[PDB]
């Protein structure tokens, strides 16, 4: 069982960084390699092979590639701590960025790193043996993630298809946001992420500095927390894979249980408990609290508000001391509790799965040793209200046709930006009729 | 071989090697890759220091 | 003499396998490491109905495990009792079907079934004279429920007249898994009435129930549901593996349940379950089984039989009992509650007694009793398969896998006479 | 004794000879080789790298 | 148990040059037996000596390379050679005149 | 003999008599069948081998003769792992 | 009194031969120096079936090396049980056919055929009364392929009434080394249905598939591959070689298989071969026996037995068993699976035992299948064979140097023929005349 991840954009390389060093630690490997010389053969070692190939004798390099335009991100990583782990090649770099313009991304400079990329993920895969799927991180905002990012899941869609992609992009938020051309980037990058990820996750940063001010009471969180608790969320939703559980779920699970219709995938996801090292020692953690603490709008990783929505489906991955008693007597309270409406195709709106293995911690990290924690992936119709918001405002600038003689210079034309603009309003009535 | 046969067919140590999976699907002389490594270096150095 | 040929499907299927062999070799005495070590002759003498003598009092089980996904078979061979196993019968897949019938049924079936059917085959003709196959597996997930019925439709029609088993665990709507639940359940049932011949319906949310009220635990894990059924399996078999007064073999207890080709899905209980804590202030008579047994709560099922009428029953004593007392008993819980059992059937309870009682008892029960109230649970499922196939929820993973719609409508029709003739019957 | 289920936690099963887990040492037949959990259990790494042709299997 | 613990036989050298110099040359290498060479323990000056030394309660003989014993073939081992049941005392009847 | 100078040979060779101690190997050089008529070129012997029965415990009996014709004769018992080697005209060394 | 000959062709065919002489000197108890040290009075009496009596316990085998590089020659000299071989069998060449079976048969040939015929009949009138000449090489290459054959023809033309078994391995399209297989092992095939008496048809293919499922070794080797050809062909003599309560010679075989003079290419398999961490769960048995050996993914042939109908069969056995046993197994056999039995010869299946086993065992089993399938195989060759014919690719390699494409056609019309004539007699009905 193997599975590869790649990263497209400064904001994937930076979540890539944090999910490494989360991954090393986990499976005890140093920063520069090997694992420490006291290490002995014991069972439960071998875990490691779903993330790490095994080179030569006593090193592992990961089944990743870091892929960026402007060689900064990618030098800071060929200089940082990590300069033994990633393999040389693995970190691909361009020459000059995209600079915040899904044109220049997609048909200037894609058209000549995308070659080098698919035919290194292609001896990424051919090293492989037993696949699971690709997995990508990316944020939609800029250029090199939105732009280029589409032009690899095509040519991924192309080389493999049936082969199962997860998307952990990272949308824009409503009113705290770094760019202005982010409504074209992103409206032009969601066109593309209809047909090709299987599954995609959306992560706001909006919402995670709420969370980050109010539970583990950061007055001043930079991008690394942002980053570390991420990473959290996509070990947790591997462990099933890594380690042995009580009932496990797989990532060809998720296509199966989370996606009734086929252009819709795209869920909100929670964690908890997102807690300190000192609320942590006051307050008793058990199964039934963090699966109320999974279910606020206070505790989500996107911006929006399910009370205005309709929960579709519902995972829920446990980590830690966990029987299958509570978690289903839990999920009984949940499902007969009428704060939360759950939609009509659905009686059984739950998938849960346990593992046994405690998420871990990290010396800079702000959480503590937690015995047991819960990560959901629900699917609502606020995110049908999540593409109106976001729709409005692109209509907004559109209309005065601002910025667009950038696109129109890269060789673009109007045409799809009518396409993509009317895509995004099917997909509305989309989710306006499923909800029904 | 077909042509030349200098070597037995049971020979010890290419039957340890052989037969050892792990060696035949990756094999290193950790030694020598750090020798040639530092010769590498000092090759460089040395273009440097003539420059200099 | 008589064989059973074990066929266990899925990830389910493998734990409740594990923990049944687990409790099958304790009760013949053969020890983890595979030798055996017992002191009655009596349990030497019939375990050709379960293992196979290899070398040096090496007995390896008669079974077949089969999935499609590693994790299940390394946890098989982790555990104790894990290492008694022939590793060629781990046929085994390699992709992973994952809540997917489909992909159980029409995809992966197709490159797994010739290796099982190559295996089962190779196990069926390696004993002389089969007294019929046993399967457990699953209805919820996909490589237990899918390839599960293409393994018993192929088997049915190769081999016609050898007995069959099986130990289907549905899913209830209160302890519910996965989304899918309703289109596999429905889809696996359609090929469960046609193809085998009789089967017995267990469900976690009973369990649970059970551990809950009686047993009396803080943290009721899988395995000790394991363990329940465990013992419910080895109570059906136990006539087969002991002498005994009254003996009622697989065939005997089917013809003496099933009126009716189509009416062959049972409810199950087992007595005694008693917490540890008042395992002593409690006597051991057969009115102390019965009341345990006939209890509703204690049913394996979410079928209560109060609403219904019990079509026929049957119960398997274990331990040197008096008939008199048995008789008498099932004699008098047959005339006092006079409305629950059917009228067109009198003697509605068949009974049987075997001498020898599971290892740290004297005296227990199993109870197999076939009820109309199976067509509740029936019908909870197949409003829920209504509920989704209406407007086509989920229903891209099965009809871009090779499959129809066509496929629905019969399911669905299937499971509407099949609860109207059991509703019929009441 | 509650039995862990599904995948993860690669066993005698998955192990072979060529992975990225799998020690090194001489093994004939791989289901000798697919018990080195069981074989070995808790020696320092280093030694394995160390003896690299030897048996110390089952 | 390594396969190469079993391996009995006896290896040459493989290709080569043709030999070209017979061994009475002087810089031919050549295999001398005497002197006698390192005798292990006390006692054991003379070749008979080491003769009694050798067969007092030391011996060795080469193993089996077949695992198993021969098993004795169908035809003797159903054939042995066997002796007749004794008869036992017969009655005898007096005659009467 | 005839054999060309860079050669080896090994064999297995077992105890005779059960429950025995030593083991004596002897290096003879000729061509006769009975050992006495034969020339004897050193002796040594594989001590402490384990009580077993008749034909089971395992010595190996290996000849290496090099090019400029020294000769080496190894003997290794299997059980206890004991090494013994033997060279023409020098010390026997163990192992 | 009873006499076979083996002759050796090319480098795998040498290799083999090198494996089965050291299993053939192990179970008859002769040192590899050549001396006989073994046990038991019943090594002695049948070993003039191979060996010569040289000085003083000394026997040497009875075999004929033939190859063209003395790679090969020397690999074999190198061996253990190497010294054994008498140096005037060493009828050998210098210059190298090269997978060129032109070169195998017209020009190296045409001049070292003569020698090697001169070697075997000196090695064939050091006896009295010989049984057959057992000929191992290959499909693929040229100096086994093509010398081998020719020398095949030769031998069937000096003497006739003698039995010939040839072990041949033939190319299989999944592993293939070299690109002119077709074009080789089409010709040697045209040329075998009318000089050989019987052919054992092996193939890597399906030998790696038993080393990898079966036996689930983690590497391998020729080593390996050339040990189960080995205890295959050992196997087969066994009969010979000692005593047992049902003898089976080599003739007594092939009259009980060939129902037709042309349907003479047999697919092999052997019993037990199990793990060794596998076989402490196994049971020895007689069944055990035959449910392995029946099997399909147990043939040594990439041919499907399943896939076509069992003309006849054979079992011959090895260890103190039960005849009563082995009959009802055999029984059990045809009477279950029935339809892949053919109808117009009732008693599909000629057995026989015998009283010693091979090394390491108690007990063991060979099966002979001629079966049907085997058109499959030769249908696979011929495909390819005609997918190059069709534009005379790589030819000139073969026309320059005297040969025509005439040769090519005749090659073409007998192996469509023989796969013609094998499916008639496979779906010929049971009860009619004409
Ligand atoms: N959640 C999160 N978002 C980040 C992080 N770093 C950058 N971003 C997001 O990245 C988006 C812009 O893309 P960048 O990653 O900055 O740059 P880019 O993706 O390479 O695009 P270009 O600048 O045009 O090359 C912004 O919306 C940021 O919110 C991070 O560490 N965490
Ligand atoms: N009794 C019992 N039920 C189980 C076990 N594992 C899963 N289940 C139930 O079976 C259903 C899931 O079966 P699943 O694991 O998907 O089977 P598979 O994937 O086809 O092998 C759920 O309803 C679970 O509650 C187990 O070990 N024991
Ligand atoms: N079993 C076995 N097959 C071999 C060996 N060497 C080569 N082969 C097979 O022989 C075929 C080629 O035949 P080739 O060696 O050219 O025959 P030759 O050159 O005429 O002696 C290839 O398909 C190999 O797979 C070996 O040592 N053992
Ligand atoms: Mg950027």
Same mark, same amino acid.
């Given at each position: 069982?193997?599975?590869?991840?790649?990263?497209?954009?400064?904001?994937?390389?930076?979540?890539?960084?944090?999910?490494?060093?989360?991954?090393?630690?986990?499976?005890?490997?140093?920063?520069?390699?090997?694992?420490?010389?006291?290490?002995?053969?014991?069972?439960?070692?071998?875990?490691?092979?779903?993330?790490?190939?095994?080179?030569?004798?006593?090193?592992?390099?990961?089944?990743?590639?870091?892929?960026?335009?402007?060689?900064?991100?990618?030098?800071?990583?060929?200089?940082?701590?990590? #300069?033994?782990?990633?393999?040389?090649?693995?970190?691909?770099?361009?020459?000059?960025?995209?600079?915040?313009?899904?044109?220049?991304?997609?048909?200037?400079?894609?058209?000549?790193?995308?070659?080098?990329?698919?035919?290194?993920?292609?001896?990424?895969?051919?090293?492989?043996?037993?696949?699971?799927?690709?997995?990508?991180?990316?944020?939609?905002?800029?250029?090199?993630?939105?732009?280029?990012?589409?032009?690899?899941?095509?040519?991924?869609?192309?080389?493999?298809?049936?082969?199962?992609?997860?998307?952990?992009?990272?949308?824009?938020?409503?009113?705290?946001?770094?760019?202005?051309?982010?409504?074209?980037?992103?409206?032009?990058?969601?066109?593309?992420?209809?047909?090709?990820?299987?599954?995609?996750?959306?992560?706001?940063?909006?919402?995670?500095?709420?969370?980050?001010?109010?539970?583990?009471?950061?007055?001043?969180?930079?991008?690394?927390?942002?980053?570390?608790?991420?990473?959290?969320?996509?070990?947790?939703?591997?462990?099933?894979?890594?380690?042995?559980?009580?009932?496990?779920?797989?990532?060809?699970?998720?296509?199966?249980?989370?996606?009734?219709?086929?252009?819709?995938?795209?869920?909100?996801?929670?964690?908890?408990?997102?807690?300190?090292?000192?609320?942590?020692?006051? %307050?008793?953690?058990?199964?039934?609290?963090?699966?109320?603490?999974?279910?606020?709008?206070?505790?989500?990783?996107?911006?929006?508000?399910?009370?205005?929505?309709?929960?579709?489906?519902?995972?829920?991955?446990?980590?830690?001391?966990?029987?299958?008693?509570?978690?289903?007597?839990?999920?009984?309270?949940?499902?007969?509790?009428?704060?939360?409406?759950?939609?009509?195709?659905?009686?059984?709106?739950?998938?849960?799965?346990?593992?046994?293995?405690?998420?871990?911690?990290?010396?800079?990290?702000?959480?503590?040793?937690?015995? #047991?924690?819960?990560?959901?992936?629900?699917?609502?119709?606020?995110?049908? %209200?999540?593409?109106?918001?976001?729709?409005?405002?692109?209509?907004?600038?559109?209309?005065?046709?601002?910025?667009?003689?950038?696109?129109?210079?890269?060789?673009?034309?109007?045409? %799809?930006?009518?396409?993509?603009?009317?895509?995004?309003?099917?997909?509305?009535?989309?989710?306006?009729?499923?909800?029904? | 071989?077909?042509?030349?046969?200098?070597?037995?067919?049971?020979?010890?140590?290419?039957?340890?090697?052989?037969?050892?999976?792990?060696?035949?699907?990756?094999?290193?002389?950790?030694?020598?890759?750090?020798?040639?490594?530092?010769?590498?270096?000092?090759?460089?150095?040395?273009?440097?220091?003539?420059?200099? | 003499?008589?064989?059973?040929?074990?066929?266990?499907?899925?990830?389910?299927?493998?734990?409740?396998?594990?923990?049944?062999?687990?409790?099958?070799?304790?009760?013949?005495?053969?020890?983890?490491?595979?030798?055996?070590?017992?002191?009655?002759?009596? *349990?030497?003498?019939?375990?050709?109905?379960?293992?196979?003598?290899?070398?040096?009092?090496?007995?390896?089980?008669?079974?077949?495990?089969?999935?499609?996904?590693?994790?299940?078979?390394?946890?098989?061979?982790?555990?104790?009792?894990?290492?008694?196993?022939?590793?060629?019968?781990?046929?085994?897949?390699?992709?992973?079907?994952?809540?997917?019938?489909?992909?159980?049924?029409?995809?992966?079936?197709?490159?797994?079934?010739?290796?099982?059917?190559?295996?089962?085959?190779?196990?069926?003709?390696?004993?002389?004279?089969?007294?019929?196959?046993?399967?457990?597996?699953?209805?919820?997930?996909?490589?237990?429920?899918?390839?599960?019925?293409?393994?018993?439709?192929?088997?049915?029609?190769?081999?016609?007249?050898?007995?069959?088993?099986?130990?289907?665990?549905?899913?209830?709507?209160?302890?519910?898994?996965?989304?899918?639940?309703?289109?596999?359940?429905?889809?696996?049932?359609?090929?469960?009435?046609?193809?085998?011949?009789?089967?017995?319906?267990?469900?976690?949310?009973?369990?649970?129930?059970?551990?809950?009220?009686?047993?009396?635990?803080?943290?009721?894990?899988?395995?000790?549901?394991?363990?329940?059924?465990?013992?419910?399996?080895?109570?059906?078999?136990?006539?087969?593996?002991?002498?005994?007064?009254?003996?009622?073999?697989?065939?005997?207890?089917?013809?003496?349940?099933?009126?009716?080709?189509?009416?062959?899905?049972?409810?199950?209980?087992?007595?005694?379950?008693?917490?540890?804590?008042?395992? *002593?202030?409690?006597?051991?008579?057969?009115?102390?089984?019965? *009341?345990?047994?006939?209890?509703?709560?204690?049913?394996?099922?979410?079928?209560?039989?109060?609403?219904?009428?019990?079509?026929?029953?049957?119960?398997?004593?274990?331990?040197?009992?008096?008939?008199?007392?048995?008789?008498? *008993?099932?004699?008098?819980?047959?005339?006092?509650?006079?409305?629950?059992?059917?009228?067109?059937?009198?003697?509605?309870?068949?009974?049987?007694?075997?001498?020898?009682?599971?290892?740290?008892?004297?005296?227990?029960?199993?109870?197999?009793?076939?009820?109309?109230?199976?067509?509740?649970?029936?019908?909870?499922?197949?409003?829920?398969?209504?509920?989704?196939?209406?407007?086509?929820?989920?229903?891209?993973?099965?009809?871009?896998?090779?499959?129809?719609?066509?496929?629905?409508?019969?399911?669905?029709?299937?499971?509407?006479?099949?609860?109207?003739?059991?509703?019929?019957?009441? | 004794?509650?039995?862990?289920?599904?995948?993860?936690?690669?066993?005698?099963?998955?192990?072979?000879?060529?992975?990225?887990?799998?020690?090194?040492?001489?093994?004939?037949?791989?289901?000798?080789?697919?018990?080195?959990?069981?074989?070995?259990?808790?020696?320092?790494?280093?030694?394995?790298?160390?003896?690299?042709?030897?048996?110390?299997?089952? | 148990?390594?396969?190469?613990?079993?391996? $009995?036989?006896?290896?040459?050298?493989?290709?080569?040059?043709? $030999?070209?110099?017979?061994?009475?040359?002087?810089?031919?290498?050549?295999?001398?037996?005497?002197?006698?060479?390192?005798?292990?323990?006390?006692?054991?000056?003379?070749?008979?000596?080491?003769?009694?030394?050798?067969?007092?309660?030391?011996?060795?003989?080469?193993?089996?390379?077949?695992?198993?014993?021969?098993?004795?073939?169908?035809?003797?081992?159903?054939?042995?050679? $066997?002796?007749?049941?004794?008869?036992?005392?017969?009655?005898?009847?007096?005659?009467?005149? | 003999?005839?054999?060309?100078?860079?050669?080896?040979?090994?064999?297995?060779?077992? +105890?005779?008599?059960?429950?025995?101690?030593?083991?004596?190997?002897?290096?003879?050089?000729?061509?006769?069948?009975?050992?006495?008529?034969?020339?004897?070129?050193?002796?040594?012997?594989?001590?402490?081998?384990?009580?077993?029965?008749?034909?089971?415990?395992?010595?190996?009996? +290996?000849?290496?003769?090099?090019?400029?014709?020294?000769? +080496?004769?190894?003997?290794?018992?299997?059980?206890?792992?004991?090494?013994?080697?033997?060279?023409?005209?020098?010390?026997?060394?163990?192992?």
């Amino acid at each position: 069982r193997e599975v590869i991840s790649i990263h497209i954009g400064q904001a994937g390389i930076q979540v890539g960084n944090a999910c490494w060093e989360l991954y090393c630690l986990e499976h005890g490997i140093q920063p520069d390699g090997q694992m420490p010389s006291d290490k002995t053969i014991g069972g439960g070692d071998d875990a490691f092979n779903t993330f790490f190939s095994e080179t030569g004798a006593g090193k592992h390099v990961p089944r990743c590639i870091f892929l960026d335009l402007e060689p900064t991100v990618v030098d800071e990583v060929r200089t940082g701590t990590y #300069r033994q782990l990633f393999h040389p090649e693995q970190l691909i770099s361009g020459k000059e960025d995209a600079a915040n313009n899904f044109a220049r991304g997609h048909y200037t400079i894609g058209k000549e790193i995308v070659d080098l990329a698919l035919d290194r993920i292609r001896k990424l895969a051919d090293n492989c043996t037993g696949l699971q799927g690709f997995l990508v991180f990316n944020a939609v905002g800029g250029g090199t993630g939105s732009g280029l990012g589409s032009l690899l899941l095509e040519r991924l869609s192309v080389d493999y298809g049936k082969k199962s992609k997860l998307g952990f992009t990272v949308y824009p938020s409503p009113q705290v946001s770094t760019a202005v051309v982010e409504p074209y980037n992103s409206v032009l990058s969601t066109h593309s992420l209809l047909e090709h990820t299987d599954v995609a996750v959306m992560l706001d940063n909006e919402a995670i500095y709420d969370i980050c001010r109010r539970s583990l009471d950061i007055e001043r969180p930079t991008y690394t927390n942002l980053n570390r608790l991420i990473a959290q969320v996509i070990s947790s939703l591997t462990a099933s894979l890594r380690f042995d559980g009580a009932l496990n779920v797989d990532i060809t699970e998720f296509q199966t249980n989370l996606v009734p219709y086929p252009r819709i995938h795209f869920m909100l996801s929670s964690y908890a408990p997102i807690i300190s090292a000192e609320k942590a020692y006051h %307050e008793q953690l058990s199964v039934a609290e963090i699966t109320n603490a999974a279910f606020e709008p206070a505790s989500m990783m996107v911006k929006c508000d399910p009370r205005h929505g309709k929960y579709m489906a519902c995972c829920l991955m446990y980590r830690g001391d966990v029987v299958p008693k509570d978690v289903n007597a839990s999920v009984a309270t949940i499902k007969t509790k009428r704060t939360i409406q759950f939609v009509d195709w659905c009686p059984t709106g739950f998938k849960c799965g346990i593992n046994y293995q405690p998420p871990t911690v990290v010396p800079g990290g702000d959480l503590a040793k937690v015995q #047991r924690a819960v990560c959901m992936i629900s699917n609502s119709t606020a995110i049908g %209200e999540i593409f109106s918001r976001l729709d409005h405002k692109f209509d907004l600038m559109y209309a005065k046709r601002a910025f667009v003689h950038w696109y129109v210079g890269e060789g673009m034309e109007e045409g %799809e930006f009518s396409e993509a603009r009317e895509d995004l309003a099917a997909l509305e009535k989309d989710f306006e009729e499923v909800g029904a | 071989g077909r042509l030349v046969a200098q070597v037995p067919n049971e020979d010890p140590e290419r039957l340890k090697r052989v037969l050892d999976a792990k060696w035949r699907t990756i094999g290193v002389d950790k030694e020598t890759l750090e020798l040639q490594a530092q010769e590498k270096k000092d090759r460089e150095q040395a273009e440097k220091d003539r420059d200099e | 003499m008589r064989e059973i040929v074990h066929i266990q499907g899925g990830q389910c299927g493998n734990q409740i396998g594990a923990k049944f062999w687990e409790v099958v070799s304790d009760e013949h005495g053969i020890d983890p490491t595979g030798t055996y070590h017992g002191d009655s002759d009596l *349990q030497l003498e019939r375990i050709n109905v379960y293992f196979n003598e290899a070398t040096g009092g090496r007995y390896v089980p008669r079974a077949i495990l089969m999935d499609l996904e590693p994790g299940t078979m390394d946890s098989v061979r982790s555990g104790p009792y894990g290492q008694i196993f022939r590793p060629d019968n781990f046929v085994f897949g390699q992709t992973g079907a994952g809540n997917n019938w489909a992909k159980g049924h029409y995809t992966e079936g197709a490159e797994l079934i010739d290796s099982v059917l190559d295996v089962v085959r190779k196990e069926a003709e390696s004993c002389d004279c089969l007294q019929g196959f046993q399967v457990c597996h699953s209805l919820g997930g996909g490589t237990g429920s899918g390839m599960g019925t293409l393994l018993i439709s192929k088997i049915r029609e190769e081999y016609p007249d050898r007995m069959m088993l099986t130990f289907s665990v549905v899913p209830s709507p209160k302890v519910s898994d996965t989304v899918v639940e309703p289109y596999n359940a429905t889809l696996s049932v359609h090929q469960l009435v046609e193809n085998a011949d009789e089967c017995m319906v267990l469900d976690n949310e009973a369990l649970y129930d059970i551990c809950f009220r009686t047993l009396k635990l803080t943290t009721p894990t899988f395995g000790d549901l394991n363990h329940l059924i465990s013992a419910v399996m080895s109570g059906i078999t136990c006539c087969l593996r002991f002498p005994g007064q009254l003996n009622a073999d697989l065939r005997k207890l089917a013809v003496n349940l099933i009126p009716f080709p189509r009416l062959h899905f049972f409810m199950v209980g087992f007595t005694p379950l008693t917490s540890r804590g008042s395992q *002593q202030y409690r006597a051991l008579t057969v009115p102390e089984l019965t *009341q345990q047994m006939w209890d509703a709560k204690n049913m394996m099922c979410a079928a209560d039989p109060r609403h219904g009428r019990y079509l026929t029953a049957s119960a398997l004593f274990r331990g040197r009992m008096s008939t008199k007392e048995v008789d008498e *008993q099932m004699l008098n819980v047959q005339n006092k509650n006079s409305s629950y059992f059917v009228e067109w059937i009198p003697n509605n309870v068949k009974s049987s007694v075997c001498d020898i009682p599971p290892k740290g008892l004297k005296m227990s029960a199993t109870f197999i009793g076939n009820s109309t109230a199976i067509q509740e649970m029936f019908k909870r499922v197949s409003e829920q398969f209504t509920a989704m196939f209406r407007r086509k929820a989920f229903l891209h993973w099965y009809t871009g896998e090779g499959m129809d719609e066509m496929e629905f409508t019969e399911a669905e029709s299937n499971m509407n006479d099949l609860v109207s003739e059991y509703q019929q019957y009441q | 004794t509650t039995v862990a289920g599904g995948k993860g936690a690669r066993g005698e099963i998955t192990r072979r000879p060529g992975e990225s887990g799998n020690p090194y040492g001489v093994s004939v037949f791989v289901d000798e080789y697919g018990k080195w959990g069981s074989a070995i259990q808790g020696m320092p790494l280093t030694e394995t790298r160390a003896r690299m042709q030897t048996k110390y299997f089952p | 148990m390594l396969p190469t613990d079993t391996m $009995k036989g006896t290896f040459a050298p493989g290709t080569t040059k043709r $030999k070209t110099v017979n061994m009475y040359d002087t810089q031919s290498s050549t295999f001398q037996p005497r002197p006698e060479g390192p005798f292990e323990a006390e006692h054991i000056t003379d070749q008979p000596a080491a003769h009694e030394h050798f067969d007092t309660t030391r011996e060795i003989k080469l193993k089996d390379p077949k695992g198993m014993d021969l098993p004795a073939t169908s035809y003797v081992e159903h054939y042995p050679p $066997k002796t007749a049941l004794l008869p036992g005392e017969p009655l005898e009847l007096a005659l009467g005149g | 003999r005839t054999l060309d100078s860079p050669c080896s040979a090994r064999q297995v060779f077992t +105890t005779v008599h059960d429950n025995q101690e030593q083991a004596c190997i002897l290096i003879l050089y000729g061509d006769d069948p009975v050992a006495s008529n034969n020339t004897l070129l050193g002796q040594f012997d594989i001590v402490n081998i384990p009580p077993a029965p008749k034909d089971v415990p395992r010595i190996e009996v +290996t000849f290496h003769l090099s090019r400029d014709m020294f000769l +080496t004769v190894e003997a290794r018992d299997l059980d206890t792992a004991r090494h013994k080697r033997w060279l023409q005209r020098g010390d026997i060394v163990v192992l």
